[PDB]
Design a protein around this ligand. Structure first.
Ligand SMILES: Nc1ncnc2c1ncn2[C@@H]1O[C@H](CO)[C@@H](O)[C@H]1OP(=O)(O)O
Ligand SMILES: [Cl-]
Length: 212
């Protein structure tokens, strides 16, 4: 009989790295909601809005950077991803993930992950809406979800990041609207915001499979 697959594969941050990022994420949301530029534009996003409340679904376990959602084999391309030599070799192995930005949209809040070439070997080739189908390099939408609005799915986060990076690719980033302690704040319109970190945040994570 066939072995079924994980619910998903990905890099699971260590306890310390997950907590560090979770805290940084929450501080960004607090700082962003307090920011004059954010308060000004509040009409294109949805007394002040507490974004920690707004993103009212948060990952309950450790934070992670998903590679391939498999749904135990039920997802397209799951078996082909899982049988890869590099996935088997990397299973249980520790990696460093670099985070270059934090972002918010009306649907999601996340961290942008900039994968190394080694790590891109674990990035699936068969994603719906791959980076390449928008002229972005593969794995450009790698992320760690920090929170979701109530009616949103965690998947949305990668789509939101791709849309943000499409825009930044058009150079439509705009002058920074603010200088937060850990970087420059950009208003991308339509309720989309990016904090571009002065120093990339490195987190430690283990590549493996989650079954729930
Ligand atoms: N097509 C899909 N359907 C469900 N979850 C997906 C998915 N693609 C990626 N994921 C990720 O798999 C995990 C379980 O649902 C979530 O963390 C989720 O989003 P995330 O990577 O943005 O957090
Ligand atoms: Cl891709």
């Amino acid at each position: 009989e066939k072995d079924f697959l994980p619910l998903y594969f990905g890099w699971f941050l260590t306890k310390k790295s997950s907590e560090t990022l979770r805290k940084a994420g929450q501080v960004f949301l607090e700082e962003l909601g307090n920011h004059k530029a954010f308060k000004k534009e509040l009409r294109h996003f949805i007394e002040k809005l507490e974004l920690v409340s707004y993103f009212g679904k948060r990952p309950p376990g450790v934070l992670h950077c998903t590679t391939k959602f498999c749904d135990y084999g039920k997802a397209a391309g799951a078996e082909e991803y899982a049988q890869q030599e590099v996935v088997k070799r990397s299973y249980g192995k520790a990696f460093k993930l670099s985070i270059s930005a934090l972002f918010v949209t009306p649907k999601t809040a996340g961290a942008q992950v900039v994968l190394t070439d080694q790590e891109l070997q674990l990035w699936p080739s068969d994603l719906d809406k791959p980076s390449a189908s928008e002229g972005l390099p593969p794995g450009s939408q790698a992320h760690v979800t920090l929170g979701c609005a109530a009616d949103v799915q965690p998947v949305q986060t990668g789509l939101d990041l791709l849309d943000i990076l499409q825009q930044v690719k058009g150079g439509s980033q705009g002058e920074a609207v603010g200088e937060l302690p850990r970087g420059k704040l950009y208003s991308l319109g339509k309720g989309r915001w990016m904090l571009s970190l002065t120093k990339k945040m490195e987190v430690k994570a283990i590549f493996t499979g989650y079954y729930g």
